[PDB]
Amino acid sequence: VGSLNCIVAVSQNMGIGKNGDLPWPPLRNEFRYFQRMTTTSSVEGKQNLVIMGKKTWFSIPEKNRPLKGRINLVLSRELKEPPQGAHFLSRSLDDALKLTEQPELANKVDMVWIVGGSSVYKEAMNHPGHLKLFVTRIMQDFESDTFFPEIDLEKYKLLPEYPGVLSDVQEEKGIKYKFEVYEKND
Numbered sequence: 092v093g094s095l096n097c098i099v100a101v102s103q104n105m106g107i108g109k110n111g112d113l114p115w116p117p118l119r120n121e122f123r124y125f126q127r128m129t130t131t132s133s134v135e136g137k138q139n140l141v142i143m144g145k146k147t148w149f150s151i152p153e154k155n156r157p158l159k160g161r162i163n164l165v166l167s168r169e170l171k172e173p174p175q176g177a178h179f180l181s182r183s184l185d186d187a188l189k190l191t192e193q194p195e196l197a198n199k200v201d202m203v204w205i206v207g208g209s210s211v212y213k214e215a216m217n218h219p220g221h222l223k224l225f226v227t228r229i230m231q232d233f234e235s236d237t238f239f240p241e242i243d244l245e246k247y248k249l250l251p252e253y254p255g256v257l258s259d260v261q262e263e264k265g266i267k268y269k270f271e272v273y274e275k276n277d
């Protein structure tokens with residue numbers, strides 16, 4: 092693996108979570124964007140790998156676990172085996188990436204997508220090498236108990252436009268949001 096992707100939706104006050112769910116009501120097209128980005132693989136015969144924290148895993152409805160069309164990996168320092176339905180378990184992002192180089196996963200994984208939560212994003216965003224951050228800016232404040240840290244512009248640059256990503260402000264259920272893409276190379 093020579094690149095990593097993070098994907099997140101964040102409120103104006105840096106919120107990503109509230110009481111084990113999203114702080115905002117469901118945005119259907121925003122979710123489909125999340126599906127499309129994480130699921131779409133450019134290589135026939137391979138699937139993308141999604142990496143998530145334990146709480147995020149259990150935030151997904153049982154009937155939708157594991158995430159279809161993707162290899163589901165859960166991070167935990169406490170679990171000794173993957174939770175029911177999950178394909179893999181690792182104690183760290185580095186361990187997870189290494190696992191991709193093992194016989195089981197060799198030639199099976201295309202892109203790697205980190206889908207939260209907070210601590211998973213923090214580790215991933217400091218990981219060396221090329222990294223893209225797909226950040227949906229929900230353009231209003233929402234009550235939250237889980238947050239996304241401000242992006243270090245010393246490392247990351249906001250890309251002005253991007254292929255496959257809409258640039259204009261979007262609106263669903265009266266809520267305005269915008270798709271952003273950040274990138275670092277080192």
Ligand SMILES: NC(=O)C1=CN([C@@H]2O[C@H](COP(=O)(O)OP(=O)(O)OC[C@H]3O[C@@H](n4cnc5c(N)ncnc54)[C@H](OP(=O)(O)O)[C@@H]3O)[C@@H](O)[C@H]2O)C=CC1
Binds near residue numbers: 166167206
């Ligand atoms: N808006 C968005 O884009 C998203 C929102 N969310 C929301 O956020 C909330 C959940 O996120 P959050 O509270 O941050 O919880 P997490 O999903 O990050 O789960 C935390 C647990 O995951 C394990 N873990 C996390 N980071 C690491 C790491 N770096 N290395 C090894 N293990 C790790 C640890 O498990 P252990 O205790 O077993 O060691 C930790 O206790 C939910 O409400 C969810 O809806 C989540 C993803 C995206």
Ligand SMILES: CCc1nc(N)nc(N)c1C#CCc1cccc(-c2cncnc2)c1
Binds near residue numbers: 122
């Ligand atoms: C709409 C959620 C979203 N948008 C973007 N741009 N990035 C994200 N990381 C997220 C998110 C989230 C939480 C999450 C993570 C993984 C799976 C799911 C999920 C929730 N409900 C049904 N299927 C999957 C929910």
Ligand SMILES: [Cl-]
Binds near residue numbers: 119120123124
């Ligand atoms: Cl759509």
Ligand SMILES: [Cl-]
Binds near residue numbers: 125126158159
């Ligand atoms: Cl999905």
Ligand SMILES: [Cl-]
Binds near residue numbers: 133134
């Ligand atoms: Cl390819």
Ligand SMILES: [Cl-]
Binds near residue numbers: 259260
């Ligand atoms: Cl428009």
Ligand SMILES: [Cl-]
Binds near residue numbers: 262264265
């Ligand atoms: Cl609307």
Ligand SMILES: [Mg+2]
Binds near residue numbers: 250253257258
């Ligand atoms: Mg733009």
Ligand SMILES: [Mg+2]
Binds near residue numbers: 258259260
């Ligand atoms: Mg606009």
Ligand SMILES: [Mg+2]
Binds near residue numbers: 258259260
């Ligand atoms: Mg548009």
